[PDB]
């Protein structure tokens, strides 16, 4: 594509180095989770879950706004970011779930957490919350895996490309050509990333081989009723129905404008009770295009849930 810099950006550009430096690691099963921690206000934790192609870096300019009211923890999911690779080299949805819940127990969380999810990130934080219902203070989602995919309608024209990666082409689409990081990632940001912000997202997957397999295998779990991995369909089916019942649990949805998936999913969002809705600048990686509004919208939401 094309794209111009937001010029107001470089005054405050947090490069990859000056993100990772501010992270702490911890051992988890046969490997580890590099992750960020506000540390301070720890009587609440708000956990941030990036999705495919990205990393905990994707929440950098979002996370400060809400640091002053609760502890925020932003992992890299396994195989992504400076987090360490997976034991078996498999990276399906539950893999990510394995290494992530395991990591949870290591954090001395409150027993009432707030999850903030994006992309497949939201899927983790939904399928956790289904299985840990007593311990969700609130949920925040965006560009989310809300429910299963039957009708491609309000959806971006991304079929056939899905067939092209659930195909055996996808190996040489993604391992060989780093398709999601190099082609898809900047494509779906409004502004152009300063050449070092891109350098961040790229570095984890800077080289050919199965080291890219997370970016290939996340979308091969697309919950399509016809042709999608049955277990994933069953997982999203299950946390939807509960989500659909989650009357007691405060929610907040953030559609992006235009959006990418937001358009098609937003109907499904308000099939979940207790959702405060809001709207912000942009495409799919909305954190690149409206972090500060995203910021203070999540802040004022948490403030509400913390008033009873």
């Amino acid at each position: 594509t094309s794209k111009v810099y937001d010029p107001e950006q470089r005054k405050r550009m947090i490069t990859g180095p000056q993100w990772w430096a501010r992270c702490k690691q911890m051992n988890v099963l046969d490997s580890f989770i590099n992750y960020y921690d506000s540390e301070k206000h720890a009587e609440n934790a708000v956990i941030f879950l990036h999705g495919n192609a990205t990393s905990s870096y994707l929440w950098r300019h979002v996370v400060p706004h809400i640091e002053p009211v609760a502890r925020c923890i932003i992992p890299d999911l396994i195989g992504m970011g400076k987090s360490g690779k997976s034991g078996n080299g498999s990276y399906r949805l539950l893999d990510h779930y394995k290494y992530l819940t395991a990591w949870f127990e290591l954090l001395n969380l409150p027993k009432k957490i707030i999850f903030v999810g994006h992309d497949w990130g939201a899927a983790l934080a939904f399928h956790y919350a289904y299985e840990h219902q007593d311990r969700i203070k609130a949920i925040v989602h965006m560009e989310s895996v809300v429910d299963v995919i039957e009708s491609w309608d309000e959806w971006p024209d991304i079929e056939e490309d899905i067939a092209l990666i659930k195909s055996e082409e996808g190996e040489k689409m993604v391992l060989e050509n780093n398709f999601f990081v190099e082609t898809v990632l900047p494509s779906k940001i409004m502004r152009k990333l300063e050449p070092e912000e891109f350098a961040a997202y790229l570095e984890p997957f800077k080289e050919k081989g199965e080291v890219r397999r997370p970016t290939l295998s996340w979308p091969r779990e697309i919950p399509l009723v016809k042709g999608g991995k049955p277990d994933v369909v069953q997982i999203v089916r299950n946390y939807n129905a509960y989500l659909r019942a989650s009357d007691d649990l405060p929610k907040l949805f953030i559609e992006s404008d235009p959006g990418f998936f937001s358009n098609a999913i937003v109907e499904g969002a308000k099939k979940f009770p207790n959702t405060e809705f809001v709207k912000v600048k942009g495409l799919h990686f909305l954190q690149e295009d409206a972090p500060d509004e995203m910021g203070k919208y999540i802040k004022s939401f948490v403030e509400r849930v913390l008033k009873n």
């Binding site: 094309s2 111009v4 810099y5 235009p258 495409l283």
Partner: protein, 229 residues
């Protein structure tokens, strides 16, 4: 021979523009130069207000002067002979979306260089569509058929935007090339070919450069002598 008009072959076209896709006031620009029976012109299009802009960039790239076109003298040149004073178009663009844009520009002359002054206002662009979705690679080449109509030549052309999925997204463009000097030999009817292609390629940018070729011609088929028309 191209003295006459007060214009040298190569010439620097400073190309200020003013834009409004949808909700968004943006005040771009373009600095360049090019040639006139080459048909070839390059512009460093800078975006100079409303960064970031919220829509695929290429919709304003045709907004960025048919002074630049190989007119073989067997087909008269409307635009060259509108100078020294210059001319004006009004462009009406209709995307297969249904979304539309009008292009209003004046191509004056002010210190030996082509001061153009483009205006561009689009809307009814659809959210899930390849302009808000920023899925446009670039413009394919195009063929703009031209014909005379009194003190005017209108151009009509089908542009195709190539998309990331290989598919295309086309639109239809009608242009009112009205001179302002009264100009003799108005032209018959012919097409101007373009390949417009972007070429500062993979940069740290801050700006996009495109290079448009522009040639007038007729056909490679030709009539049975019987004719009609």
């Amino acid at each position: 021979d191209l003295a006459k008009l007060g214009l040298k072959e190569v010439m620097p076209t400073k190309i200020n523009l003013e834009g409004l896709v949808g909700d968004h006031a943006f005040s771009m620009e373009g600095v360049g130069e090019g040639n006139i029976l080459e048909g070839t012109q390059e512009v460093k299009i800078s975006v100079t207000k409303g960064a970031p802009l919220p829509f695929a960039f290429d919709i304003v790239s045709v907004a960025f002067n048919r002074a630049y076109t190989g007119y073989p003298e067997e087909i008269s040149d409307y635009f060259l002979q509108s100078f020294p004073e210059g001319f004006t178009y009004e462009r009406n663009i209709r995307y297969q979306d249904g979304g539309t844009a009008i292009v209003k520009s004046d191509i004056s002359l002010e210190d030996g260089k082509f001061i153009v002054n483009v205006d561009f206002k689009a809307k009814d662009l659809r959210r899930m569509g390849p302009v808000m979705q920023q899925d446009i690679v670039g413009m394919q080449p195009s063929y703009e058929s031209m014909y005379t109509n009194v003190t005017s030549v209108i151009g009509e052309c089908i542009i195709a935007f190539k998309l990331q999925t290989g598919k295309h997204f086309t639109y239809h463009m009608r242009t009112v090339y009205k001179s302002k000097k009264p100009v003799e030999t108005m032209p018959l009817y012919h097409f101007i070919q373009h390949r417009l292609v972007k070429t500062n390629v993979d940069t740290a940018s801050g700006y996009v450069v495109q290079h448009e070729t522009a040639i007038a011609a007729h056909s490679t088929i030709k009539k049975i002598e019987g004719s009609l028309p």
